[PDB]
Design a protein around this motif. Structure first.
Motif, PDB file in Angstrom:
ATOM      1  N   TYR A   6      -1.886  10.441  -1.138  1.00  0.00           N
ATOM      2  CA  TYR A   6      -2.393   9.279  -1.337  1.00  0.00           C
ATOM      3  C   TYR A   6      -2.988   8.113  -1.571  1.00  0.00           C
ATOM      4  CZ  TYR A   6      -6.542   7.487  -4.409  1.00  0.00           C
ATOM      5  OH  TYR A   6      -7.424   6.704  -4.760  1.00  0.00           O
ATOM      6  N   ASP A   7      -1.520   7.248  -1.917  1.00  0.00           N
ATOM      7  CA  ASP A   7      -1.148   6.207  -0.858  1.00  0.00           C
ATOM      8  C   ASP A   7      -0.963   5.949   0.403  1.00  0.00           C
ATOM      9  OD1 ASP A   7      -1.342   5.072  -3.603  1.00  0.00           O
ATOM     10  OD2 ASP A   7       0.419   5.521  -4.467  1.00  0.00           O
ATOM     11  N   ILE A   8      -0.540   6.971   1.320  1.00  0.00           N
ATOM     12  CA  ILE A   8      -0.506   6.841   2.517  1.00  0.00           C
ATOM     13  C   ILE A   8      -1.720   7.415   3.372  1.00  0.00           C
ATOM     14  CG2 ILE A   8       0.672   7.969   4.619  1.00  0.00           C
ATOM     15  CD1 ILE A   8       2.951   8.544   2.506  1.00  0.00           C
ATOM     16  N   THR A   9      -2.684   7.324   2.829  1.00  0.00           N
ATOM     17  CA  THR A   9      -4.126   7.682   3.643  1.00  0.00           C
ATOM     18  C   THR A   9      -4.778   6.898   2.974  1.00  0.00           C
ATOM     19  OG1 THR A   9      -4.085  10.135   2.965  1.00  0.00           O
ATOM     20  CG2 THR A   9      -6.282   8.979   3.098  1.00  0.00           C
ATOM     21  N   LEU A  10      -4.602   6.230   1.761  1.00  0.00           N
ATOM     22  CA  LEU A  10      -5.562   4.457   1.552  1.00  0.00           C
ATOM     23  C   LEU A  10      -4.810   3.574   2.382  1.00  0.00           C
ATOM     24  CD1 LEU A  10      -5.758   4.152  -2.108  1.00  0.00           C
ATOM     25  CD2 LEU A  10      -7.685   4.969  -0.765  1.00  0.00           C
ATOM     26  N   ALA A  11      -3.737   3.367   3.175  1.00  0.00           N
ATOM     27  CA  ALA A  11      -3.313   2.508   4.018  1.00  0.00           C
ATOM     28  C   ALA A  11      -3.410   2.814   5.172  1.00  0.00           C
ATOM     29  CB  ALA A  11      -1.709   2.419   3.724  1.00  0.00           C
ATOM     30  N   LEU A  12      -3.478   3.877   5.884  1.00  0.00           N
ATOM     31  CA  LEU A  12      -4.220   4.516   6.928  1.00  0.00           C
ATOM     32  C   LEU A  12      -5.777   4.121   6.699  1.00  0.00           C
ATOM     33  CD1 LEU A  12      -3.658   5.424   9.574  1.00  0.00           C
ATOM     34  CD2 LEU A  12      -3.497   7.765   9.044  1.00  0.00           C
ATOM     35  N   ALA A  13      -5.965   4.051   6.102  1.00  0.00           N
ATOM     36  CA  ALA A  13      -7.649   3.775   6.005  1.00  0.00           C
ATOM     37  C   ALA A  13      -7.724   2.011   6.360  1.00  0.00           C
ATOM     38  CB  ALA A  13      -8.448   4.516   4.996  1.00  0.00           C
ATOM     39  N   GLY A  14      -6.869   1.439   6.247  1.00  0.00           N
ATOM     40  CA  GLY A  14      -7.484   0.171   6.193  1.00  0.00           C
ATOM     41  C   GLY A  14      -6.964  -0.529   7.050  1.00  0.00           C
ATOM     42  N   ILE A  15      -6.222  -0.112   8.488  1.00  0.00           N
ATOM     43  CA  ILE A  15      -5.840   0.088   9.423  1.00  0.00           C
ATOM     44  C   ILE A  15      -7.071   0.021  10.448  1.00  0.00           C
ATOM     45  CG2 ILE A  15      -4.381   0.318  11.510  1.00  0.00           C
ATOM     46  CD1 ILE A  15      -1.998   1.376   9.410  1.00  0.00           C
ATOM     47  N   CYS A  16      -7.471   1.286  10.001  1.00  0.00           N
ATOM     48  CA  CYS A  16      -8.854   2.188  10.570  1.00  0.00           C
ATOM     49  C   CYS A  16     -10.223   1.433  10.208  1.00  0.00           C
ATOM     50  CB  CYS A  16      -9.029   3.759  10.108  1.00  0.00           C
ATOM     51  SG  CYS A  16      -7.545   5.168  11.232  1.00  0.00           S
ATOM     52  N   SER A  49      -0.793  -4.540  -7.555  1.00  0.00           N
ATOM     53  CA  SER A  49       0.039  -3.570  -8.172  1.00  0.00           C
ATOM     54  C   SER A  49       0.644  -2.138  -8.123  1.00  0.00           C
ATOM     55  CB  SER A  49      -0.186  -3.573  -9.775  1.00  0.00           C
ATOM     56  OG  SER A  49      -2.273  -3.150  -9.913  1.00  0.00           O
ATOM     57  N   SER A  50      -0.678  -1.312  -6.694  1.00  0.00           N
ATOM     58  CA  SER A  50      -0.764  -0.314  -6.302  1.00  0.00           C
ATOM     59  C   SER A  50      -0.786  -0.511  -4.580  1.00  0.00           C
ATOM     60  CB  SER A  50      -2.059   0.563  -6.946  1.00  0.00           C
ATOM     61  OG  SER A  50      -2.961   0.201  -6.908  1.00  0.00           O
ATOM     62  N   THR A  51      -1.184   0.306  -4.220  1.00  0.00           N
ATOM     63  CA  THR A  51      -2.022   0.487  -3.275  1.00  0.00           C
ATOM     64  C   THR A  51      -3.102   0.238  -3.042  1.00  0.00           C
ATOM     65  OG1 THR A  51      -0.561   2.468  -2.706  1.00  0.00           O
ATOM     66  CG2 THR A  51      -1.723   2.335  -0.839  1.00  0.00           C
ATOM     67  N   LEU A  52      -4.121   1.058  -4.047  1.00  0.00           N
ATOM     68  CA  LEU A  52      -4.907   0.995  -3.803  1.00  0.00           C
ATOM     69  C   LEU A  52      -5.544  -0.471  -4.175  1.00  0.00           C
ATOM     70  CD1 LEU A  52      -8.361   1.343  -3.806  1.00  0.00           C
ATOM     71  CD2 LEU A  52      -8.323   2.852  -5.995  1.00  0.00           C
ATOM     72  N   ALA A  53      -5.121  -1.552  -4.897  1.00  0.00           N
ATOM     73  CA  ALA A  53      -5.123  -2.434  -6.009  1.00  0.00           C
ATOM     74  C   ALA A  53      -5.402  -3.546  -4.266  1.00  0.00           C
ATOM     75  CB  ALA A  53      -3.890  -3.635  -6.346  1.00  0.00           C
ATOM     76  N   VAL A  54      -4.412  -3.200  -3.273  1.00  0.00           N
ATOM     77  CA  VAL A  54      -4.633  -4.828  -2.237  1.00  0.00           C
ATOM     78  C   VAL A  54      -5.735  -4.679  -2.047  1.00  0.00           C
ATOM     79  CG1 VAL A  54      -4.087  -4.045   1.073  1.00  0.00           C
ATOM     80  CG2 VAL A  54      -2.281  -3.509  -1.932  1.00  0.00           C
ATOM     81  N   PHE A  55      -6.670  -3.327  -1.711  1.00  0.00           N
ATOM     82  CA  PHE A  55      -7.938  -3.271  -1.310  1.00  0.00           C
ATOM     83  C   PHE A  55      -9.240  -3.671  -2.437  1.00  0.00           C
ATOM     84  CE2 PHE A  55      -5.317  -0.971   0.935  1.00  0.00           C
ATOM     85  CZ  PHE A  55      -5.551  -1.050   2.551  1.00  0.00           C
ATOM     86  N   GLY A  56      -9.048  -4.185  -3.306  1.00  0.00           N
ATOM     87  CA  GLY A  56      -9.508  -4.667  -4.735  1.00  0.00           C
ATOM     88  C   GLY A  56      -9.399  -3.484  -5.792  1.00  0.00           C
ATOM     89  N   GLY A 174      -5.778  -5.835   9.271  1.00  0.00           N
ATOM     90  CA  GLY A 174      -5.044  -4.609  10.349  1.00  0.00           C
ATOM     91  C   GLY A 174      -3.518  -4.353  10.342  1.00  0.00           C
ATOM     92  N   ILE A 175      -3.000  -5.644  11.250  1.00  0.00           N
ATOM     93  CA  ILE A 175      -1.892  -5.475  10.892  1.00  0.00           C
ATOM     94  C   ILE A 175      -0.774  -5.516   9.457  1.00  0.00           C
ATOM     95  CG2 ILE A 175       0.094  -7.077  11.008  1.00  0.00           C
ATOM     96  CD1 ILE A 175      -0.771  -6.129  13.484  1.00  0.00           C
ATOM     97  N   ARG A 176      -2.098  -6.401   8.389  1.00  0.00           N
ATOM     98  CA  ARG A 176      -1.169  -6.326   7.349  1.00  0.00           C
ATOM     99  C   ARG A 176      -1.397  -5.138   6.618  1.00  0.00           C
ATOM    100  NH1 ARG A 176       0.143  -5.397   2.557  1.00  0.00           N
ATOM    101  NH2 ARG A 176      -0.548  -6.715   0.420  1.00  0.00           N
ATOM    102  N   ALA A 177      -2.699  -4.284   6.712  1.00  0.00           N
ATOM    103  CA  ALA A 177      -2.728  -2.515   6.634  1.00  0.00           C
ATOM    104  C   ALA A 177      -1.566  -1.726   6.582  1.00  0.00           C
ATOM    105  CB  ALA A 177      -3.597  -2.226   6.611  1.00  0.00           C
ATOM    106  N   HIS A 182       3.747   1.275   5.965  1.00  0.00           N
ATOM    107  CA  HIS A 182       5.203   1.615   6.471  1.00  0.00           C
ATOM    108  C   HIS A 182       6.313   1.658   5.029  1.00  0.00           C
ATOM    109  CE1 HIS A 182       6.021   2.333  10.392  1.00  0.00           C
ATOM    110  NE2 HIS A 182       4.464   1.972  10.442  1.00  0.00           N
ATOM    111  N   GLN A 183       4.926   0.767   4.548  1.00  0.00           N
ATOM    112  CA  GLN A 183       5.944   0.440   2.761  1.00  0.00           C
ATOM    113  C   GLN A 183       6.141   1.430   1.951  1.00  0.00           C
ATOM    114  OE1 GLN A 183       5.650  -4.672   1.980  1.00  0.00           O
ATOM    115  NE2 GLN A 183       3.997  -3.472   1.748  1.00  0.00           N
TER     116      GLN A 183
END
Length: 213
Positions: A6-16, A49-56, A174-177, A182-183
């Motif tokens: 779930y978290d890996i998909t969200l961070a990849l979606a931020g790159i995309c 505080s979570s992966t999803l929090a990065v994206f609001g 994109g770099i930030r995502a 990787h984290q």
């Protein structure tokens, strides 16, 4: 918490999502304003505080990225407009790996990002001033670590320095995502070995976002 798709998909979606906003900017000179707001905010939204929090904090904020991820992972021409998105996603991943390997670079990057407060006091995040300041972080700290990411689209549109600044700032998002990716357990091999899991997970999120269908 523990590594999960779930978290890996969200961070990849931020790159995309960065890849897709760049494509829109390079061809049209404008992009989805809500998605760009989410992506630019992810640069400055401190101590999530979570992966999803990065994206609001809301999956809807990654809709553009999650739709993009479906084509990047499964659309297979090495040509067409869709292949530009794959090139940008992979180029951001390569550059992030160089960034995270280079002694002191992530420290420099964090310090430069927090220094945006010098301008945020007076100017909004989406202003020309901030776009230029974000672009200068990407150009000064990140881009020199490899050959330039090649952005194509409409040549005359790309002659605008305001467009160039928006493109570079979106690349910084994109770099930030990619750092987040990787984290949370993402990477070259994990992507090779998990394309279906990631695709399935993205389609599940898009369905969750669309109860009317």
């Amino acid at each position: 918490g523990a590594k999960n798709y779930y978290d890996i998909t969200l961070a990849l979606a931020g790159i995309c999502q960065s890849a897709r906003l760049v494509q829109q900017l390079a061809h049209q000179g404008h992009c989805d304003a809500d998605a760009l707001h989410v992506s630019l905010n992810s640069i400055i939204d401190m101590n999530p505080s979570s992966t999803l929090a990065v994206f609001g904090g809301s999956e809807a904020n990654l809709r553009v990225g999650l739709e993009t991820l479906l084509g990047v992972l499964n659309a297979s021409s090495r040509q067409g407009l869709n292949a530009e998105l794959t090139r940008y996603t992979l180029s951001l991943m390569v550059l992030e790996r160089k960034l995270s390997s280079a002694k002191g670079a992530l420290d420099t990057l964090g310090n430069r990002i927090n220094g945006l407060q010098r301008q945020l006091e007076h100017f909004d995040l989406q202003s020309e001033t901030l776009m230029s300041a974000m672009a200068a972080i990407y150009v000064d700290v990140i881009s020199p670590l490899g050959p330039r990411i090649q952005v194509t689209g409409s040549p005359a549109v790309l002659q605008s320095p305001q467009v160039q600044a928006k493109v570079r700032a979106t690349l910084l998002a994109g770099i930030r995502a990619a750092v987040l990716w990787h984290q949370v357990g993402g990477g070259r091999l994990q992507l090779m070995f998990s394309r279906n899991r990631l695709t399935t997970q993205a389609k599940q999120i898009l369905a969750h976002l669309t109860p009317e269908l």
